[PDB]
């Protein structure tokens, strides 16, 4: 019906600065800095204090108002990600052919290489994305762990790796093999 004012809040935790101009956002906290282009949305920011900023949509129709909240979340995950930061854990599921997962590199690349997937003489390679770092758990078997400031980039990499192991021409209810995401929390604040 066109809601004349509708707005949302973004708490700025102690230790971060978020600066915003022509809807180009930059979040700077402990873990470093992220930026994001929010040009594609008409919303207007306003700072009340160094701990609070508001996002508002004036005279917006429904789907306009929808975009509001998502702006808050996106910016939020910038903040937390640069304070707490994100970390995705996965697991190797395979019922007979052990999945061999190692890091390689050509041209200072860093890829995720996946060998022996269900017996495949092929080798799979998933680019390791910038500012997402790859580790391997020491007690937890067949684990893999992906961490960094940016969910988007950390999530997606985890998803690129799951998606490269997708099982073709078999009944995927029987043949469950793959690298699936098992946990998603922060780097800090316990596990």
């Amino acid at each position: 019906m066109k809601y004349i004012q509708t707005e949302q809040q973004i708490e700025v935790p102690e230790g971060v600065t978020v600066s915003i101009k022509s809807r180009i956002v930059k979040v700077v906290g402990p873990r470093g800095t992220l930026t994001k282009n929010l040009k594609h949305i008409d919303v207007t920011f306003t700072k009340v204090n160094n701990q609070l900023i508001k996002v508002a949509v004036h005279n917006g129709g429904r789907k306009h108002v929808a975009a509001l909240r998502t702006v808050k979340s996106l910016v939020d995950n910038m903040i937390t990600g640069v304070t707490k930061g994100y970390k995705y854990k996965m697991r190797y599921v395979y019922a007979h052919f052990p999945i061999n997962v190692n890091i390689v590199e050509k041209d200072g690349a860093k890829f995720i290489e996946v060998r022996n997937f269900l017996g495949d003489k092929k080798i799979r390679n998933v680019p390791v994305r910038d500012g997402v770092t790859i580790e391997f758990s020491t007690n937890v078997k067949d684990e893999i762990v992906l961490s960094g400031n940016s969910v988007e980039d950390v999530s997606q990499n985890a998803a690129d790796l799951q998606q490269i192991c997708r099982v073709r021409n078999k009944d995927i209810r029987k043949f469950l093999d793959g690298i699936y995401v098992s946990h998603k929390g922060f780097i800090t604040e316990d596990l």
Binding site: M1, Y3, I4, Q5, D42, T44, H58, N59
Partner: protein, 172 residues
């Protein structure tokens, strides 16, 4: 049916020796001129009482000017209308300065949304919602808050000449 005027129409049955002085009947009628008003008075009368104009006469026709035509009001509007497949009753509210103002957006609003031309719409009752918070339709409650203020983002000044020696700004 356009720029609206509101009319009182007072009419009656033609007198019979048996019934000299028949009862007088009144309607408030919204039409643009008085001919359509009078014509509307019959349309409705014919549906309520057993009467056509060939057997009745119209006694009076007087315009009802808005009492306080610069006070902003919240209006209750009850309506009966014909869709393509049914006929329906319908309440909606309109914030404006006069009844005559309100009815016109009512008549447009019915076309915009339910595609209802003037012909297919009966105006049941219209009324100034006295106590705010008797307003129920949000899209008017929205304007009732204390110190209501809002901007008008993305100004678009129309141009007088077709070429412009500067890239326009939309800044209000």
């Amino acid at each position: 049916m356009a720029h609206f005027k509101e009319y009182q129409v007072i009419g009656r049955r033609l007198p019979t020796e048996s019934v000299p002085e028949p009862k007088l009947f009144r309607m408030r009628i919204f039409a643009s001129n008085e001919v359509i008003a009078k014509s509307r008075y019959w349309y409705f009368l014919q549906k309520l009482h057993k009467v056509k104009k060939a057997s009745g006469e119209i006694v009076s026709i007087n315009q009802i000017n808005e009492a306080h035509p610069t006070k902003v009001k919240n209006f209750g509007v009850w309506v009966r209308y014909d869709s393509r497949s049914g006929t329906h009753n319908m309440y909606k509210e309109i914030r404006d300065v006069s009844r005559v103002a309100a009815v016109e957006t009512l008549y447009q609003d019915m076309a915009a949304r339910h595609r209802a031309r003037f012909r297919s719409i009966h105006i049941l009752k219209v009324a100034e919602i006295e106590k705010t918070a008797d307003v129920k339709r949000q899209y008017v409650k929205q304007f009732l808050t204390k110190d209501l203020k809002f901007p008008l983002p993305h100004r678009v000044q129309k141009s007088t000449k077709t070429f412009s020696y500067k890239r326009p700004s939309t800044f209000y």
